[PDB]
Design an enzyme around this catalytic site. Sequence first.
Site, PDB file in Angstrom:
ATOM      1  N   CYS A  61       4.879   1.596   9.707  1.00  0.00           N
ATOM      2  CA  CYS A  61       4.427   0.640   8.700  1.00  0.00           C
ATOM      3  C   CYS A  61       5.613   0.041   7.959  1.00  0.00           C
ATOM      4  O   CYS A  61       6.504   0.762   7.498  1.00  0.00           O
ATOM      5  CB  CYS A  61       3.471   1.307   7.708  1.00  0.00           C
ATOM      6  SG  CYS A  61       1.764   1.425   8.275  1.00  0.00           S
TER       7      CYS A  61
ATOM      8  N   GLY B  67       3.876   5.792  11.405  1.00  0.00           N
ATOM      9  CA  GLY B  67       5.027   5.802  10.532  1.00  0.00           C
ATOM     10  C   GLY B  67       5.857   4.540  10.574  1.00  0.00           C
ATOM     11  O   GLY B  67       6.816   4.424   9.800  1.00  0.00           O
TER      12      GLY B  67
ATOM     13  N   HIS C 220       0.809  -1.215   0.000  1.00  0.00           N
ATOM     14  CA  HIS C 220       0.000   0.000   0.000  1.00  0.00           C
ATOM     15  C   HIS C 220       0.846   1.271   0.000  1.00  0.00           C
ATOM     16  O   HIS C 220       0.335   2.358   0.306  1.00  0.00           O
ATOM     17  CB  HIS C 220      -0.985   0.000   1.178  1.00  0.00           C
ATOM     18  CG  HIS C 220      -0.373   0.344   2.501  1.00  0.00           C
ATOM     19  ND1 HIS C 220      -0.113   1.643   2.881  1.00  0.00           N
ATOM     20  CD2 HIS C 220       0.065  -0.440   3.516  1.00  0.00           C
ATOM     21  CE1 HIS C 220       0.441   1.647   4.081  1.00  0.00           C
ATOM     22  NE2 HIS C 220       0.558   0.396   4.489  1.00  0.00           N
TER      23      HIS C 220
END
Lengths: 299, 299
Positions: free
Chosen positions: B143, B141, B39
Amino acid sequence: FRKMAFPSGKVEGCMVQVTCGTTTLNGLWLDDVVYCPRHVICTSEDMLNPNYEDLLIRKSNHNFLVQAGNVQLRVIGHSMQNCVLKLKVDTANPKTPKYKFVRIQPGQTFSVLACYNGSPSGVYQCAMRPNFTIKGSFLNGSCGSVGFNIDYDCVSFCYMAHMELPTGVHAGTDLEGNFYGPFVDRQTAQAAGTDTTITVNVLAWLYAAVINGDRWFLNRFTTTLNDFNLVAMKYNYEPLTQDHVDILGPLSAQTGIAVLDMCASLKELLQNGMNGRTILGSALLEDEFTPFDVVRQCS
Amino acid sequence: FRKMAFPSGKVEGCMVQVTCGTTTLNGLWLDDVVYCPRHVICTSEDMLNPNYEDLLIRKSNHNFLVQAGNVQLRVIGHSMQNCVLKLKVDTANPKTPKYKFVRIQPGQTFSVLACYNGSPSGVYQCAMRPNFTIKGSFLNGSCGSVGFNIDYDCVSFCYMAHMELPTGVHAGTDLEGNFYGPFVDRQTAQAAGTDTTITVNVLAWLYAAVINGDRWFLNRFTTTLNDFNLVAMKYNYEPLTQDHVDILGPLSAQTGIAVLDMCASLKELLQNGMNGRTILGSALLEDEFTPFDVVRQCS
């Protein structure tokens, strides 16, 4: 709310194995010097009442076997600074980070790299207790394990382990050989003094719960610093000083809760109890987060 | 009893930053391939109902910016495997450790290296909950943060974080892009099913208490496996299986306490309660230590 340790890569590159006779423990290799506990020149029969000053003169450089992984370091000199031994080697460590030596105060936090062999095996985050001991791990061989903080790219070394006490805690020195607390490196009966909860840290942990939306413990009331410390002494809490109140200023601004207001909250939890409810997933008050830790994790 | 994480140095040498348009997150650089959440090609608009096959078809290699510290890597290929994106680069990672990819089951433990920038910032030890979520960091952040175990110099990768759920926990995938649990990488109303305590881990944590000389919770009773599960489920505990009974065999041998006797102990704490005493320093029963973990720290 995870208790997090600093990444240990920069310290992992400095761990070595130091063997003298039958005893082996971990050392810290920075530039062309290896640092380790001085009681490595002792055996078990030597630990009783050793005179390190007299014993060290009979040692020679090749009496010390230092291995950096599968490579042997050539020792070319030895010296002693307080309770820390300094072995000079012919090769500077190419993996040496930007670093410095510091001494911390009771209540402050740091990360420990536990090496229970001569190679690192685990890392954890802890706090220096008011009685100057550290809980940590329970499997030994980690003598010479190091504790540190990281600020951007600079490693601040603050602790090296020397002994394990009967209650599962260990005791140690800063990297300049000065002990923390009233301990010695002899084979005498030693015991830790009664411990106490770190008040300013518990208060910082309550600010973090309010930041994460946990607000049931707040109330309408406030207290004076004198009235609170009378409560603190009855439940074995450290007294709160004006120095500690100032450190909490930022969190009081960010949350809108006056420091003495949070003390009112803490006063009720101690006197009355937590009534079954939990703060951040815990039924006990946590005291191993410093104010600085909370802001670092909450931006 | 310290909850310990593995030393993180070998993973720190593999963390990179991946930027696509306005979105940036963390990636894993092994050999000449960077792995990251797919993503990263999405906006705040596309996360509702993204069509990844259509979004990826519109990309070219120069659309992806990969930074390894102070150096930029040249992308020479892109591909997608389930929910993970794979970027091929012209340079192999010189710090690549011996590694492999594995998929874990609920109840297992591992270490998480949280990089909320593109640079590492903390490390912690956790367990995959029965509802397939992870009690993780709270500032985002992160991820693309990675979870791993280390056994005999080999890094076993088992987790990558993809999404933040409404309760503050994270959900993610294995390194082959398959999610854990019934989650998807869309920003739609999702919620974790009710969680439960990991029974076999709590029993292993009670054996560790007996190893440290703490026996106050034991009693003289035994139980049947069925009667135990009847009580256990009433407190939101996972049922105990015959496979879990076998796993504990070694620890019962080392201590001399039959597994179903220890179940009797736990049954009493649950039915009657703990109240004022604490076991291993906690007023709650701990469930993030597996049998394997216990044997590795208590010899």
